[PDB]
Swiss-Prot record, chains A, B:
Function: Involved in the synthesis of meso-diaminopimelate (m-DAP or DL-DAP), required for both lysine and peptidoglycan biosynthesis. Catalyzes the direct conversion of tetrahydrodipicolinate to LL-diaminopimelate. Is also able to use meso-diaminopimelate, cystathionine, lysine or ornithine as substrates.
Molecular function, one GO term: L,L-diaminopimelate aminotransferase activity
Organism: Chlamydia trachomatis serovar D (strain ATCC VR-885 / DSM 19411 / UW-3/Cx)
N6-(pyridoxal phosphate)lysine modification, residue list: K218
Protein's UniProt keywords contain Transferase: yes
A GO BP annotation: lysine biosynthetic process via diaminopimelate, diaminopimelate-aminotransferase pathway
Pathway connected to this protein: Amino-acid biosynthesis; L-lysine biosynthesis via DAP pathway; LL-2,6-diaminopimelate from (S)-tetrahydrodipicolinate (aminotransferase route): step 1/1
Binding site for substrate: G34, K87, Y110, N156, N257, R345
Family: Belongs to the class-I pyridoxal-phosphate-dependent aminotransferase family. LL-diaminopimelate aminotransferase subfamily.
Cofactor field: pyridoxal 5'-phosphate
Name by which UniProt lists this protein: LL-diaminopimelate aminotransferase
Keyword line: Aminotransferase, Pyridoxal phosphate, Transferase
Entries under InterPro entries matching the protein: Aminotransferase_I/II_large, DapL/ALD1, NHTrfase_class1_PyrdxlP-BS, PyrdxlP-dep_Trfase, PyrdxlP-dep_Trfase_major, PyrdxlP-dep_Trfase_small
Assembly and oligomerization: Homodimer.
Gene field: dapL
Amino acid sequence: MKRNPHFVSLFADLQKRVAQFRLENPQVINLSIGPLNASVAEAFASSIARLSSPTDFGLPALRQKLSEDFYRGFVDAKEIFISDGAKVDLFRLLSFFGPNQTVAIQDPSYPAYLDIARLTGAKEIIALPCLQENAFFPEFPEDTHIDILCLCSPNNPTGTVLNKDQLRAIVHYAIEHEILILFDAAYSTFISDPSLPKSIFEIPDARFCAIEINSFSKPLGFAGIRLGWTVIPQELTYADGHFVIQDWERFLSTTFNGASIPAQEAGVAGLSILPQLEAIHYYRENSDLLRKALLATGFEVFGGEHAPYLWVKPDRDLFDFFLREYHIAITPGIGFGRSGSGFVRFSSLGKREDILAACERLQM
Amino acid sequence: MKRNPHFVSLFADLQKRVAQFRLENPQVINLSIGPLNASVAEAFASSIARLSSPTDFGLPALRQKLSEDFYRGFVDAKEIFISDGAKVDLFRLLSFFGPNQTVAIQDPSYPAYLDIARLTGAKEIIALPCLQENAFFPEFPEDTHIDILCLCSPNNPTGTVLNKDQLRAIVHYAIEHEILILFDAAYSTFISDPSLPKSIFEIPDARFCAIEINSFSKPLGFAGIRLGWTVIPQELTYADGHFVIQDWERFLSTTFNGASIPAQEAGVAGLSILPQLEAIHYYRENSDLLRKALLATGFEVFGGEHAPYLWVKPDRDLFDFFLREYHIAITPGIGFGRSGSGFVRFSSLGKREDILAACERLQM
């Protein structure tokens, strides 16, 4: 039994070395990192009760409520597959397409994409620089065949959203070069400008070249819900005219036994209270707060309105600078990749107390 | 985007065509196929309560209780990885070993092995005939290199258990030819003779060539618990002396985000009440019942003491014969594979009412 080839090519680590600084400066606000909702839990329990009394791609009620409330009718229930989270789905996806794909990803990169690409067999991996001069529109190589394009919108780490016009461009480019697009919209719920697309299926032609994955986990309010979903259009087709959706059903039947039903039952209630939650207006606040603190204290601030990420311009100068000069841990850009250089990712997903404390250490 | 090669090579189906017979003979006991425990659910809920109040490889308490109660000390907590079920684990495993393996499986086969092998890239698949002349000891080919050997003990479909002496043989054969053994013990809880091994780790040398997967789901009492575990020995090594357990940790971190914690909390309570459950003495009963009915009515009966499967000798003669001559649906042997020929699988996992009704239609 020889070891895995696809394996041998593989942060943070940033967190250990920060406990370090604390064990060495004991007299630090951690913004480099991250309670279950009342209605959600009641549904959970009621689901459990249902099970302890006498008497597949997802609970029909959940596939439905997604269609109608979450996707606002743009997606059909039968196009929606419930799984236990966005990451496993991304793994099952890339795994499903087979090895030797060449796969392009945004740079700066959410690093789980790179790994799973490497792990699932990619022939090459192409970083698509995304930079504010270009409004973060990724820069495609002329001219290199790409097979799969991973997108992450709203974006981790830029906290940026590809808008309507931008996605239309990407989709046209995609169909033009026969690129399958994998579209990760796990942060979509954080969008606060009701114009911007929330799903890639709001974009002309997306159904002939695109899949979406999404989850609860981070809307937030959803702690302990092992639950996500994948969307495959009926229209989506391999080179030879076979339907992706069909291969996906076989695949799923063979390798998955579905999400937990109580968690499914719990998603349904979550969809109900979904668009209310100051439980996200709370974070929009953190982001505002940071932003102005940051702009007041001289910085260039990007992101933060439609995701819990501030992308901030003032390389190992960076981590240790912020810790020392401000007592704020962050994640330095270049960690997420090569066009990360010169930037820092602040995370907005914390207690207001600390958010305020950090905003203070930006005065003097 | 070309379709998946590994894909193009892929029951039941038996169930549709049985509804058929009913829509055509309206004046049938279904033994071809299959309530959440009170303590388990209480734990679930309490877990949920815990989550709705303010404030990785598995819940430590669960990894522990497995070690100590389930594995009876034979396995260490750190060797135990919690996932959301045995099947996904088998998929993640074979996926993890990479493609081009040649993989041997028992014949008669539990058919998910074949698929997942095919799907994950196998170069060849070798059926290992298991037959009662040989006490169901699988028959190895001289002399064909095999890389992985899947075992299923207690066995679906024979309802058979490889015993101590048998596994010692297989393990010696395995280390001798450098075969990794994948050992599926999901039915172990049904063992009712306290001599027989329950885990492969009760067998000298198993740790230098074997992994085990197991779950709750079917002990039974565990409906709606998306929960299994995998066991990797510290000692287990690739050809080049690298440690499997280590590659597995990386792999898992990249592609899984763990079992649900409430389901984990719920497993713990389940381990407590685990060895009590007439909730399995109930089925042992069904099996007794069937067995004698079957022997009284002239048949050859195998299995049924240590799993909910009776393997019965009296090929398309079979399905439609049983339906017509007895009004009992079964699963015919040859469905699980080529050395299935001449046998039928009865399933013992039903209401006592129907078990009794079936035993009746064996008189005249």
